[PDB]
RNA sequence: GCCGUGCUAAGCGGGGAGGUAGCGGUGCCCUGUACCUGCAAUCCGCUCUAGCAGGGCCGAAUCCCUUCUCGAGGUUCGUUUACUUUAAG
RNA sequence: GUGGAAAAGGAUGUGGAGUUGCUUAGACAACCAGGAUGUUGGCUUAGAAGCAGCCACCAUUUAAAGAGUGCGUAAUAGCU
């Protein structure tokens, strides 16, 4: 449930994605990383079933680090109407995710927890996906 | 070969011990006294009992020294030990009373001297957190 | 860690030859066994002594070397003194007899169950519950084995029916 | 792997200064058989014996290249080796050969350690 | 049996056999039996 | 201890396909002439083996142990009837 | 029968290119031996001693025994 708290626009458009994302090519902040490897949507519901995922295997850390914040609204119109009249409501937001992501960064856990977190975390989401840690 | 920790408080009923005497092919009642007579030297202890069973049909009956710790409750004061470790410390034990208690197991014991003796009891005594002085 | 080029012998008295290119024929004291095999392989026998021999070394020429000199090794000393397998039966009324020269089981049903052995291969009853099969090929023989012991699998609840000698089976506890 | 090197320069400077050694298989280790030999080696001698078992060709001939090339023998198998110091073994050797002749498993019927030169019926 | 399209072995014992274009799994344990497709 | 005055309690059935190296019990047979409601079998009270709440007991042991019994069931054999079901002749 | 229809996921399928400990002071397996003592770890089960758990992470000569990975009504067995 990650909401941006004032928006300029509440609808706009839905966007073209292609190449890779420009900034967050490295793991930074904590020492392990994971990476998007494909470009899709991903919604408040998948970044909080990661950190849920993420959070109760690994019960300790020192935070959870996530990287992305949804901003997109994206809009639905209402089921079984005939298409057109205008632009529908607005439902949720969609964080916009590019190649060579970094998602989600780990620090202060050890080797073989951090894999099996970032296993069990990274099966939640629709995109294809690397494990990485820090140079 | 079976090993028995017999009390000084009661050898003769069936409900302790029964078929453990029972099913070693030796009358249970025949040897009682010879039991009880072993036992009243050390009268006030549990003393183990080694029963074994020769090829010949031989039975023979061996005693040994109590377990350790035994005497440990009694110079606490207390039966039963804290069973949380190594933070409930309430026995407080002489290096003296150490001594004491690792010669009354110079025989039985396998350990090579009076320092692994100690060794042993500070093992066993990190258990339930009992302090030796 | 090879049991490819590791070399194997004929202990005493058994005789072997070579027919046609990959048929083995082996008489031993109890009988003759003859088998044929694809013509990659290579054999030579020399006076007590054979010896294998693969053209290239590749994935199943690996594991076709290997098993032909185990296969061979295995009929040899099986031409040599024969097989046993013993099968155990557990019941209170479960009974198995030896009529002519076949073998009769009783052991839940209301007709008995027959076995013809036909390829010379013994069944004997020592007692009631045991029963032992003896053989020169080890294949038949645990054909023979699987074969009786298809006729009641042993279950788990109660150990019961046949079982091999000393084989573990599954406890599950029935309330 | 250097560290086998250190426990084989140890061990020849154990047995440079070792003047006696007496043959004991590592076979049939009940426990009953070594708590009761080795105390009884206890009440018996010193400590100095040694319960080593590694008995690979690159230790044996090690050791006979020195002193004592008798090793060949010995090669195979696993035997354990005994330092002795102190008192020239007579008594001692006479305990060994009759609680290895009075069961209490064998040893190989004597299979002889070169103290100076020992090949046979050490007593 | 166990016919799912993910099979991994669920205790240590388990080993997998690839068998008849169809890679089974065996384990002393038959609630550990599964093969996919 | 002759006994009398105010009061009691251990205790008021077991055996034999049973369940834990564990007693009681809601099949079965017995003497019953010894009391009633509940819990208690793909189960409950429960551990010197007493099933658990109360009351009907003069009230202490003839009802706690010892030849004081055969007998009412659990048995390798029953070649001694004979019936009944599948088959070596 | 891919070619001649399609995904998250699963795998000792297979061909290439690498990295990393053992690698003949004898490795991985196989077989033969070893598997103890304080100590039956407490304390609720007069049953648990690996058969539930407050719970330690000792020392012996061991480079072998961890107070323990396994048929086992609860220990006691050919057993790992």
Request: charged letters at 30%.
């Amino acid at each position: 449930m990650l909401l941006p708290k004032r928006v300029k626009y509440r609808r706009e458009h839905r966007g073209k994605m292609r190449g890779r994302a420009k900034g967050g090519t490295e793991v930074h902040f904590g020492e392990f990383g994971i990476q998007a490897l494909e470009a899709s949507w991903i919604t408040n519901r998948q970044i909080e079933a990661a950190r849920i995922a993420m959070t109760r295997y690994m019960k300790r850390g020192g935070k959870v680090w996530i990287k992305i914040f949804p901003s997109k609204p994206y809009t639905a119109k209402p089921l079984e109407v005939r298409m057109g009249s205008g632009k529908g409501a607005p439902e949720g937001w969609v964080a916009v995710v590019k190649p060579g992501k970094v998602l989600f960064e780990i620090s202060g856990v050890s080797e073989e927890v951090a894999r099996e977190a970032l296993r069990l975390a990274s099966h939640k989401l629709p995109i294809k996906t690397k494990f990485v840690k820090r140079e | 070969v079976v090993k028995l920790q017999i009390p000084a408080g009661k050898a003769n009923p069936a409900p302790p011990v029964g078929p453990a005497l029972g099913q070693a092919g030796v009358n249970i009642m025949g040897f009682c006294k010879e039991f009880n007579a072993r036992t009243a030297d050390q009268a006030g202890l549990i003393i183990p009992v080694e029963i074994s069973v020769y090829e010949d049909r031989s039975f023979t009956f061996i005693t040994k020294t109590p377990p350790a710790a035994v005497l440990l409750k009694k110079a606490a004061g207390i039966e039963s030990g804290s069973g949380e470790p190594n933070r409930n410390k309430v026995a407080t034990v002489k290096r003296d009373k150490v001594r004491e208690i690792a010669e009354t197991k110079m025989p039985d014991l396998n350990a090579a001297d009076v320092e692994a003796a100690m060794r042993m009891v500070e093992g066993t005594a990190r258990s339930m957190g009992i302090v030796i002085e | 860690s090879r049991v490819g080029k590791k070399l194997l012998e004929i202990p005493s008295d058994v005789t072997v030859t070579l027919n046609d290119n990959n048929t083995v024929a082996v008489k031993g004291p109890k009988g003759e066994l003859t088998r044929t095999f694809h013509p990659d392989m290579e054999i030579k026998v020399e006076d007590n002594v054979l010896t294998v021999a693969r053209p290239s070394d590749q994935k199943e020429h690996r594991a076709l070397h290997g098993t032909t000199r185990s296969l061979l090794g295995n009929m040899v000393e099986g031409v040599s003194k024969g097989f046993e397998r013993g099968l155990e039966l557990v019941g209170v009324g479960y009974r198995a007899s030896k009529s002519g020269n076949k073998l009769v089981l009783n052991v839940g049903y209301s007709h008995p169950v027959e076995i013809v052995p036909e390829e010379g291969i013994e069944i004997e009853v020592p007692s009631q519950t045991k029963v032992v099969v003896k053989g020169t090929d080890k294949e038949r023989v645990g054909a023979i084995a699987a074969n009786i012991r298809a006729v009641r699998s042993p279950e788990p609840y109660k150990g019961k029916g046949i079982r091999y000698e000393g084989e573990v089976v599954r406890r599950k506890e029935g309330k | 792997a250097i560290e086998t090197k250190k426990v084989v320069v140890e061990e020849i400077a154990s047995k440079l200064k070792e003047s006696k050694s007496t043959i004991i298989v590592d076979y049939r280790g009940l426990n009953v058989s070594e708590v009761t030999e080795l105390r009884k080696q206890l009440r018996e001698a010193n400590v100095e014996f040694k319960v080593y078992k590694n008995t690979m060709t690159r230790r044996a001939v090690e050791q006979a290249e020195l002193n004592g090339l008798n090793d060949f023998l010995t090669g195979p198998n696993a035997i354990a080796f005994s330092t002795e110091d102190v008192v020239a073994p007579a008594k001692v050797l006479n305990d060994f050969a009759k609680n290895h002749e009075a069961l209490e498993i064998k040893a190989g019927v004597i299979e002889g350690k070169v103290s100076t030169v020992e090949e046979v019926k050490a007593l | 049996m166990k016919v799912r399209p993910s099979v991994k072995p669920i205790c240590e014992k388990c080993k997998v056999i690839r068998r008849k274009g169809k890679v089974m799994v065996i384990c002393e344990n038959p609630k550990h039996k599964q093969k996919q497709g």
